[PDB]
Design a protein around this ligand. Structure first.
Ligand code: A1D7M
Ligand code: A1D7M
Lengths: 292, 300
C-alpha cells in the first residue's frame, strides 16, 4: 500500500534529556558532550536581552537528566547559539549516532518525536508549510522535541520546538538555532505569511488516491490544463508555482505513468476542486514518499 | 492539533532480529530467551504439513542475528505455536521490556514497526479493518514485522506480518500464532469478506475535522438523523451498526460537546457525503478513513 511513512524513533529516544532550570522544564537532545535546548528555559526574554541573561545563568541551576540511560549530567559551560542553548556536559553521550544538522526547505516532511520530561511520548508526521510553520501537537513542557529524518545510520536533525501560535501552528529553529520563517520565541502577536499550497505535495496526494482507491473518481477533471495555464491561475489562487522543486518532476512523472493520468489532468482537478476548498492537510504527501 | 499518534519504536527496535533459513530471510522478535517469527521461513507448505516439517527442521539452519546489539543468537529448540515458530535461544535478551500478548478487535489501531534484515526501516499507523486485514506497506523480507502499542512501560504486541493480498491488503497473526480472520499463510487465492466501514472511526474522522480544520464546513449536514434510522441505512451501505463499540460513546459524546455538533448530525453527514462529497478533502483524505479512532481523537 501507500502510507504516511515515519522514521523509527530509537536513536532520538536514547539522546533525549530533561532540562529543568529554576522551575522551568523542557526537553533537550544530547549529542557528543553537548545538550541542545531552547533558550527560554532560563526565562521569558525578548530581542537582545538573551546574551546578557545567558551569561549570568548559573550552570548548577541546569538540572539535566537522561531518562533512557538513568544518568544525571552536569553542565560545565553554557553557550547560546542562535535561539538555542548549547550546554557542555562532562559526559560524552555513548549513544550518539552519526548525525547532521540540516535545514529543511518548505514542502519537506519530517518525523516529530514529541517528548515530555525527556521521554518521547508520541511520534507523528509533519510537513513544513510555505508559511514556515508546522501543524503539530504540543502541550506545556514539549519544547525541545526534535523533528528528524533518517538515511541509513545517520540521524538528520531538522527541528527543535519552541512556540505554539493561536491558530494551532507551531514554530521552532533548526539545530543551528535559527528559526524557520520570521517567528521568534516571544509571547506576543506575530504576523504570519499568508498560507500557500505546496502544489507538488497536493499532486502527490491525488496520485496516491488514484493508486489506492479502485476506480477513477468522478470528480477527477476530464480535460487537462497546461502547466503554464495552471501557473497563471495558481498565482491568483494561493497555490505555489509548479513545480515547487524541479527534482520532484521525476517522481511525479513516474506517478503519472503508473496511474496513467497525465499531470496536466491532476492540475485541472486541483483548479476544479476550488469550490470545495473555499491548513487542511493536503500538503502532507510528498512526491518522493508516494513514489518510493 | 489532532494528529495520528504513533508509539515510540525504540523498545521494539532493540528486540528485532533477522531469521534466515536455507535461503529464506525474514524478521523476528526476541523476548526473554525466545525468538518469534513466521513459520513459512522453513518453506511454503500448505494445510497440515507444518507439524512434520517443523519437527524435522534442523536447529543449525536457523541463522538468527540481532543487529542493534551485535549479537548472533544460536537456536536451542524450535517449536511451532499456531502459525508462528518459537525459537528458543541460549541467550536471554536483557532489553526485554515488560510485555503482553494482546489480540486486537477490529476498529482498533496499532503502530507497525516495518523491518528488514532485523532493522526497523519505517514506522506507521494502521487499524484492523472489519475484514480482519490491515492496509499496510510491505515488501519482501518484511514478514516478522510487528504491530504494537504502549501503555506507559508495557509493550503490547498485537500483530506479526505474514501475507500481502493483491488488493494491497496485509494479514498476519497475533503473537499467540492465530491469524486475524480466515486467512492462512499460503500463496493461494483466499476469499475476502466484503469491506465494511468502522462507523465509530469514520465518525471520529469527521469530528477531527470540526476540531482542527473547519468548525462549520459546507458539507456538514444541517438536519440530523437518528441512530436508529442510520443503522437501517447502514445495513445496505457497508457501514457497521453504530456504535461498533459501546465504550467509544464516552469519547464520541465528548467530541460532540466540544465541537457542539451532535453525533446525529455527523451520522447524517456520512449519509449525505455518500452522494454529495464530490471530492471534498476531510481531515486530509479524499475518502472515508478508519484510521482515526474516537479514543485517539479525544485523548490525543
Ligand atoms: C515549550 N515547552 C512551550 C510549548 C507550547 C505550550 C503550548 N503548546 C506548545 O507548543 N512553548 C511555550 O510555552 C512558549 C514559550 C515562549 C516564550 C517561546 N509560549 C507559547 O507557545 C505561547 N504562544 S504565544 C507565542 O504566546 O502565542 C503559549 C504558551 C500561549 C502557547
Ligand atoms: C514475507 N516476508 C512476505 C511479504 C510480502 C511480499 C510482498 N509484500 C508482502 O507483504 N510474504 C510472502 O512472501 C508470502 C509468503 C507466504 C508463504 C505466506 N506470500 C505472499 O504474501 C504472496 N501473496 S499471495 C497470498 O500469494 O497473494 C505474494 C508474495 C505474492 C505477495
Amino acid at each position: 500500500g501507500i502510507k504516511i511513512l515515519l522514521h523509527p524513533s530509537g536513536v532520538v529516544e536514547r539522546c533525549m534529556v530533561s532540562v529543568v532550570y529554576n522551575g522551568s522544564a523542557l526537553n533537550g537532545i544530547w549529542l557528543k558532550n553537548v545538550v541542545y535546548c531552547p533558550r527560554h528555559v532560563i526565562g521569558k526574554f525578548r530581542g537582545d536581552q538573551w546574551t546578557h541573561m545567558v551569561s549570568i545563568a548559573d550552570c548548577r541551576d541546569f538540572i539535566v537528566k537522561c531518562p533512557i540511560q538513568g544518568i544525571q549530567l552536569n553542565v560545565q559551560s553554557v553557550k547560546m547559539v542562535g535561539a538555542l542553548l548549547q550546554l557542555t556536559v562532562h559526559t560524552n553521550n555513548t549513544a550518539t549516532p552519526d548525525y547532521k544538522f540540516e535545514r529543511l526547505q518548505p514542502g519537506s516532511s519530517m518525523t516529530i518525536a514529541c517528548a515530555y520530561d525527556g521521554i518521547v511520548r508520541h511520534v507523528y508526521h509533519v510537513v513544513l508549510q510555505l508559511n514556515n510553520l508546522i501543524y503539530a501537537s504540543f502541550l506545556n513542557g514539549a519544547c525541545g522535541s526534535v523533528g528528524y529524518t533518517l538515511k541509513g545510520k545517520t540521524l538528520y536533525l531538522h527541528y527543535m520546538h519552541h512556540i505554539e501560535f493561536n491558530n494551532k501552528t507551531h514554530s521552532g529553529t533548526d539545530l543551528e538555532g535559527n528559526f524557520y520563517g520570521p517567528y521568534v520565541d516571544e509571547e506576543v502577536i506575530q504576523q504570519q505569511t499568508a498560507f500557500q499550497y505546496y502544489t507538488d505535495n497536493v499532486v502527490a496526494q491525488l496520485y496516491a488516491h488514484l493508486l489506492t482507491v479502485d476506480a477513477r473518481p468522478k470528480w477527477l477533471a476530464q480535460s487537462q490544463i497546461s502547466i503554464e495555464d495552471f501557473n497563471s491561475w495558481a498565482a491568483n489562487n494561493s497555490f505555489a508555482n509548479f513545480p515547487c522543486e524541479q527534482t520532484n518532476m521525476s517522481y511525479i512523472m513516474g506517478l503519472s505513468q503508473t496511474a496513467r493520468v497525465p499531470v496536466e489532468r491532476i492540475l485541472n482537478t486541483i483548479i476544479q476542486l476550488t469550490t470545495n476548498r473555499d491548513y487542511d492537510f493536503e500538503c502532507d504527501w510528498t512526491p518522493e514518499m508516494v513514489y518510493n
